[PDB]
Each structure stands twice: as structure tokens, then as C-alpha cells.
Amino acid sequence: QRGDVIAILQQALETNSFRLLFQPVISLRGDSHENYEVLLRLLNPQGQEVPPAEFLHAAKEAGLAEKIDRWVILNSIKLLAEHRAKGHQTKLFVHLSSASLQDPGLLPWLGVALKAARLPPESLVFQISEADATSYLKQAKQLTQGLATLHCQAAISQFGCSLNPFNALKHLTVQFIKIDGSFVQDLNQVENQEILKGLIAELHEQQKLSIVPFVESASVLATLWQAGATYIQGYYLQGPSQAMDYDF
Amino acid sequence: QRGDVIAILQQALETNSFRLLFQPVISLRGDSHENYEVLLRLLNPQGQEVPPAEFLHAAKEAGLAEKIDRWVILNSIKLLAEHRAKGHQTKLFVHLSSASLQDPGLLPWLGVALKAARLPPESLVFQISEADATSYLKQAKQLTQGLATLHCQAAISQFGCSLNPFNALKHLTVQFIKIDGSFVQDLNQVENQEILKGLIAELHEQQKLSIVPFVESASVLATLWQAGATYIQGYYLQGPSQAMDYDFSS
Numbered sequence: 001q002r003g004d005v006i007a008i009l010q011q012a013l014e015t016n017s018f019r020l021l022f023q024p025v026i027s028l029r030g031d032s033h034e035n036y037e038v039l040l041r042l043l044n045p046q047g048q049e050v051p052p053a054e055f056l057h058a059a060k061e062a063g064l065a066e067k068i069d070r071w072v073i074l075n076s077i078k079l080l081a082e083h084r085a086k087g088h089q090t091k092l093f094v095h096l097s098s099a100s101l102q103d104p105g106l107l108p109w110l111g112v113a114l115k116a117a118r119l120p121p122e123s124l125v126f127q128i129s130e131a132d133a134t135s136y137l138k139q140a141k142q143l144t145q146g147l148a149t150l151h152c153q154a155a156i157s158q159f160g161c162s163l164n165p166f167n168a169l170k171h172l173t174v175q176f177i178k179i180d181g182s183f184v185q186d187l188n189q190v191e192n193q194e195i196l197k198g199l200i201a202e203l204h205e206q207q208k209l210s211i212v213p214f215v216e217s218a219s220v221l222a223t224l225w226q227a228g229a230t231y232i233q234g235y236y237l238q239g240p241s242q243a244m245d246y247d248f
Numbered sequence: 249q250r251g252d253v254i255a256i257l258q259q260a261l262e263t264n265s266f267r268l269l270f271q272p273v274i275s276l277r278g279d280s281h282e283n284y285e286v287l288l289r290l291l292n293p294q295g296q297e298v299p300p301a302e303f304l305h306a307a308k309e310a311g312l313a314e315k316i317d318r319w320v321i322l323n324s325i326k327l328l329a330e331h332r333a334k335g336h337q338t339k340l341f342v343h344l345s346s347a348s349l350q351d352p353g354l355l356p357w358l359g360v361a362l363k364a365a366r367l368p369p370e371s372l373v374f375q376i377s378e379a380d381a382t383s384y385l386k387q388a389k390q391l392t393q394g395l396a397t398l399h400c401q402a403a404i405s406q407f408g409c410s411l412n413p414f415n416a417l418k419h420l421t422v423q424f425i426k427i428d429g430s431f432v433q434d435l436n437q438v439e440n441q442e443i444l445k446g447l448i449a450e451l452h453e454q455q456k457l458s459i460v461p462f463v464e465s466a467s468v469l470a471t472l473w474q475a476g477a478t479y480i481q482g483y484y485l486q487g488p489s490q491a492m493d494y495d496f497s498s
Contacts, residue, residue, distance in 0.1 A: 001487045005464040052300055054483045058464045062434050186310050216253040216306045235302045239249040 003048050005058040013067055017043040020075060021240035024248070025093065025211060025233045028225060034248055037093040037127075037233065038076050039240050040068075065099035070109065077117045077124075083244055084120055090244060093125045093155060093176075098132040102139050107146040114150060121151035125176060130158045134168050144173040155211070160199055169206065176231075177203050178211035187223050200228045249297055253306045256298060257290070261315055265291035268323055269488035272496070273341065273459060273481045276473060282496050283479065285341040285375075286324050287488050288316070313347035314354070322361055324372070329365045331492050338492065341373045341403060341424075346380040350387050355394040362398060369399035373424060378406045382416050392421040403459070408447055417454060424479075425451050426459040435468050445475040452476060 012018055018040060025035035042055050059068050076094055084090055100106055126147060133140035133156065144154045155176035159165055160183060169177075183196050196212075203210045215221050215234035224232055238246055260266060266288060273283040290303050307316050324340050331338050348354050362372075374395055381388040381404055392402045403424035407413055408431060417425075431444050444460075451458045460472050463482030472480055486494055 001489055002483060002485060004466065005483050007465065049487065051483060051487055054462065054464060054487075057429055057433070057462050060433055181305055185305070185308055214302060214305050216302060216309075217255065218252065235249070235251055235253050235298060237250065239251075239297065239299055239302070241249065 001048070003045075003050070005050055005054060006061065006064065008045065008048070008050060009042070009055075009058055009064055009068065012042055013071060016071075017045075018071060018075075019043055019242065020072065020079065021242060022092075022244045023233060023240040024238050024244075024246040025231050026237050026248070027231055029230050031231075032089055034088060034090040034244065034246070035093065035125075035231065036090070036244050036246070038072060038095070040072055040095075060097055060099070062099050065097040066103050066106075069095075069097050069100040073110070074113060077113065077119055080123060081117055081119060084123065088244075091123050091125060093127050095127050095157075098129075098136070101128060101132055101136055101143060107143065107150070111150060122153060125153040125155050127155045127157050127178070128174075130156050130160070130162055130165060130168070130180075133172075134162045134165075137168060137171060140168075141171050148173050157211075166202065166206065169208070175209055176211055177208045178213060181214050184212060184214040184220065187220050193223060193227070196223075197227045204228060204230075249295075251296060251298065253298055253302055254309060254312065256293065256296070257303075257306055257312060257316065259293075260290060261319060264319075265293070266316075266319060266323070267291055267490070268320070268327065269490060270340075270492045270494075271481060271488045272486045272494045273479050274485050274496075275479055277478050279479075280337065282336055282338040282492070282494070283341065283373075284338065284492055284494070285481065286320065286343070288320060288343075308345055308347070310347045313345040314351050317343075317345050317348040317354075318357065321358065321372075325361055325365045325367060327492070328371055329367060332368070332371070336492075339371055339373055339401075341375050343375045343405075344391075346377070346384070349376060349380055349384050349391060355391070355398070358400075359398050362400075370401060373401040373403050375403045375405050375424075375426070378404055378408070378410060378413065378416070378428070381420065382410055385416060385419055388416075389419050389421075396421050414450065414454065417456070423457060424459055425456045426461060429462045432460060432462045432468065435471050441471060441475065444471070448476045 021039040022036040023039060025037060042050055044050060059065055073094060076092055080092055147154050154174040155178055156174055157178040158180045159177045161180050186192050200210050209230045211231040212224050212229045213233045215232045215236050217236055269287040269289055270284040271287060273285055290298055292298055321342055324342050328340050376388060395402055402422045403426055404422050405426040406428045407425045409428050434440050448458050457478040459479040460477040461481045463480050463484050465484050
């Protein structure tokens, strides 16, 4: 039970052997939109099961990651056109890797891609880890302006771990801030409640829309109400499915 | 799918609906022992599919985390006893959550559970995140002195991400240091090679045995030999198996 996972990814792109899942994002302060996060899984060569963490790790590798990011975008748009066509007012969050964020030719590739899609506006929100972009701050700035231009949105995920996390946002064009898992633990404790309240209040003072992930029970879901959260995500609401079939 | 994941876990502890996987940790310097890492899987109540990452996140919630860690440890101890009764010299690497790191009843419970199984000395390696060890240094000190007392060993995993990471080692009893994946990416670039290499050497300077994970292809194998890694791990060598059936003599 083993294999070169690089080669497996390279030969998965070669053959379009991937799938996309959709994990809805749920509005606590109104949004007409159907928001889903796009997640990626690998269709395994027949016997082999590539463990997810090892898969994701491999797919961050420079020059594999760009190709992969592009497959997701491309196919994300393809499906997104099939879907909205149904009259559906839908919006997809897509991940971008560190590599992609660095890749000067991305906004170009994306423009041409989006034309061929005749894709509705403000339907794509691009998502960047706070680490990738606290690091590549200038490339993230170029990219998020670039993205406004195309009538696209942008989000920082895993927000609030870094030193002074509000600083990087003075420099970006992002509407959403998906808070880090670490803030959504042991919420039954006040200090953790309070910590999450303040974090969320400051994002609101900065006119960002907060997204709180990892809602794993009904209770936490209440605390996120009084905390001010704008959106939530998790398995208690819905897990990642092959279809954008959530009843909002 | 949909579900209260905290609920599910607490019933899974009820129905022992967990499953342990085992992933070999390969020696490069010729350690004869078998070494495996222990990994937790949830048996999904029929139809369900609880995403791993959400599973793991909830498995961290205080109160729940300690019990799950105990489930894991007791089951690791039984399978281990079984495996070694057939003549294998085998060590198991077992994760402790943060909640367990601050649980003052963890050590008396383990000492009991070890004596009950009559596991020989140096069979279990308890693995603590750098972040948890760093957040809770004083507790990690006590736990690791406690562990040595019980002829157990310890490892810091995800090591090297924090500022001055060697500082926390000055206060702990740990034989193994498992380096964060961050150091293993893009190893075709000489800078990344040189940084891996200087990390591993400082560890060797500090008389720690280094473990390098996320070995995903042959190319990085060679790099890791030359940098001096003591152990390595990744799907390129062997993925997680439901049983300890890996032939370490290839």
C-alpha cells in the first residue's frame, strides 16, 4: 500500500481524475446567495487510497499546485454555469495555493477563462490562507485588485492566528474573513466566547463579512449568533456533497 | 450529509466505533525496531461520512479529547501486546491532545494500564504538537518526566514552526523530534535543502532523533539521506494499514 503521490497527481490531471465537493456556507445575517465552498478530492487509482493530508501536502508543491488550482477553477466555472442556468443565484468559494498567488500569469489565465464562461458577476469568491499572503503580501495585493477588476471577490481563511492579523487587510481587497478553527474550540468557556466576540466585532468595524467554520453541534451555533457572526459552516449544517443541493 | 459531530463521537466511545490505523516510521540509520505511528479513524454510523478534519477538530473539544485519547491508548496497548507476543520488537507513536497534556489523572491511569498489559519498557512513544507543548510548557515538562518514569518515550511533532523552537526542548524529556511538513515542500530548491539540513544537524547536536514526514516520492528520499534524517515517513514508503503487517526488511 504505497505510491509516488506526485506522479499520481500528475497523472490525475492528465486524465481529469478529480472530483469537487460543495460545502454550503450559511447566512446568519441575510444573504440571498447560495454560498458553497469548493473542496477537492482525488479519485484514487483502483487499489490505492491516498491519505488526504498527504494528498493536500503533495498538491502544494510548486508547479503541481498551479496546474491543480487551475483545474479546480476551470471545472468550478463549468459546473457553476450549468447550475446558475437553472435560475439559481449561487456563489462559490475557491481555494488558491501559495504558488498560484505568486504566479504572475494567473489573472491573465483567469480573464480568458471567465470570458469563455460568460460567467455572471460576483459569483466567485477567491480564498487565500492568512499565512500565504501574510508572507506574499505584495503579490496578494496585486492579485486582489486584479480580482476586483474582474468583478470577483476574495477572502482570507484561517484568519486571526498571525501577529497583528488586521494589518494585512489594510492592503487587500477582500470582503470575507473566514476565522481559524482554533477560535471555535471549547466555546463553552467565556474567555473563548469573549475572544471570538471581539475578533468578530473588529472585523465588522472593518466592514468585513465574518465566516465561522467548524460548527459541530447545535449549541456552538447559538453562541455564534450572539457573537455577531455573519456566516457559519460545518457538518451540523451540512457536510461536503457532490451536489449544490442545499435548501437554504 | 448532516450531523451533530460531538454527539456522534460520544456514542462512538460508547460503541467502540473507532479504528486504529498504523503507518510505519522507517529507520535510515538502521534501527531494527519496527516503528509505527497510530492514526485514528471514525467508523461512521451507517450512511454517514464525517469529514476527517471536522472529526479531528471535534475530537479536540475538552472532556471528549481525554477519553478519545484513552480509547486510543488502551487499544494501542492491547494490539501492541498482541503484536509483540508473536516475537516482533515494535514501538508505537501515539498522539496526545492538548486536553490530555493538562490532565493530571493521565499518568496514574496509564501506569495502571501499562502494568495490566505487562508491556515491556520503551514500547510507546507519546507524540505532542510543538504548539501544545509550547503553549503548556510547564505541564509538558511534568508529563514527559512522568512518562520517562514509566519507561515510555516522547516525541515533539510539527517541530520548527515557532520562533526559537529549540527553546522548548530545553525543558522537556523527548528523544524524538518530528519535523513539520513545512520543511519538506519544494525540496528541489537548494535553500530548502540547506535549511532542512541545518535543522536536522542542530537536532543531532542536541542528541535528538529526527523524523521527517510527508515523503511522497523518490527524489526527496535521496535528499533526506544526505541531510541526515534518522527516520522518515510517507505514502511513498507505506501508507496507513489496518494492521501492523509491514515488512521492515522490505
